[PDB]
Amino acid sequence: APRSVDWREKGYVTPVKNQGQCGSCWAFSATGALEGQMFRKTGRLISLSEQNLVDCSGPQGNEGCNGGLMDYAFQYVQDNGGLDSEESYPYEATEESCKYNPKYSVANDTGFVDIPKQEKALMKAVATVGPISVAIDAGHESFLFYKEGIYFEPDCSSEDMDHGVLVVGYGFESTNNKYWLVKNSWGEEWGMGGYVKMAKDRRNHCGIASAASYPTV
Numbered sequence: 001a002p003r004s005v006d007w008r009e010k011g012y013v014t015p016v017k018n019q020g021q022c023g024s025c026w027a028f029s030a031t032g033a034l035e036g037q038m039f040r041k042t043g044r045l046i047s048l049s050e051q052n053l054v055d056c057s058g059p060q061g062n063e064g065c066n067g068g069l070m071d072y073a074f075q076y077v078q079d080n081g082g083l084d085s086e087e088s089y090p091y092e093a094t095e096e097s098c099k100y101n102p103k104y105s106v107a108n109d110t111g112f113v114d115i116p117k118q119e120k121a122l123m124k125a126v127a128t129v130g131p132i133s134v135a136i137d138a139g140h141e142s143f144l145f146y147k148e149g150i151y152f153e154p155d156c157s158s159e160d161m162d163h164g165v166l167v168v169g170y171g172f173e174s175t176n177n178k179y180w181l182v183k184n185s186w187g188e189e190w191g192m193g194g195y196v197k198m199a200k201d202r203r204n205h206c207g208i209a210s211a212a213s214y215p216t217v
C-alpha cells in the first residue's frame with residue numbers, strides 16, 4: 001500500500017454534511033461510501049439522500065433516527081433498485097414516510113463487501129477501493145470536543161462502536177504518528193473542517209477496523 005492516501009482531492013468525496021439532532025450517522029456513512037463508488041464508476045460526484053435511507057430502510061433492519069447500520073443501507077439500495085439524490089429528497093433530521101421516487105434515482109448498488117477486521121486490511125481497501133464506511137467508538141467527551149491533531153483516547157474500545165463515519169484516507173505526521181483521515185457528519189465546525197485524524201496502527205484504536213465495508217456498484 002502507498003505511505004499515504006487521500007480521496008478528497010481526487011473527486012470522490014462530497015462536502016461535509018450535518019446530521020443534526022437525528023441518529024442518522026449510519027446514513028451519512030453509507031451515502032459517503034456510495035458517493036465514492038458511484039464516482040469511481042461514472043466519474044460524477046452526486047450528493048445522495050440520507051433522508052431516503054432514514055425513511056425507507058426500516059425493513060432491512062434500520063431504526064431511522066434511533067440508528068442503523070451501513071450494510072443495511074447498502075442492502076436497501078440493492079433491494080430498492082436505487083437511491084434518490086440529496087437535491088430531490090432533502091435532509092430533514094427527522095423520520096417520516098417513505099417518499100422514494102425512482103425517477104430521481106441517481107445511484108445503485110449490487111451488494112457490499114465486509115473488510116476483514118484488521119487495520120492492514122482496512123489500509124489495503126482504502127488504497128484500492130476509495131472511501132470506506134466504518135464504525136468507531138465515539139462515545140467519549142474527547143471525541144465530542146475534538147478540534148485538531150491525532151485523536152487518541154486511552155479509554156476507547158476496539159469492540160464496542162457506536163458511530164458510523166467514513167475513512168477517506170490515511171497518512172503520517174513526519175514531524176504514534178500515523179492516522180486515518182475520517183469524515184464525520186457533525187458539520188464543518190466540528191474537528192478539522194468536519195474531519196478527524198484517528199490514531200492508526202495503535203491496536204485498532206476505537207474499533208475503526210472492526211466494522212468496515214463498502215458497496216459494490
Ligand SMILES: *C(#N)C1([N]C(=O)[C]2[C]C3=[C][C]=C(O[C]/[C]=[C]/[C]OC4=C([C]=[C][C]=[C]4)C(=O)[N]2)C(Cl)=[C]3)[C][C]1
Nearest residue numbers: 023024025026066067068069135161162163164211
Ligand atoms: C449514529 N448517529 C448513531 N449510531 C448508530 O446508528 C450505530 C452505528 C454503528 C455502530 C456499530 C457498527 O458496527 C458494529 C455493529 C453493531 C450493532 O449495532 C447496531 C446499530 C444499529 C442497528 C443495529 C445494530 C448501531 O449501533 N448503529 C456499525 Cl456498522 C454502525 C445513532 C447514534
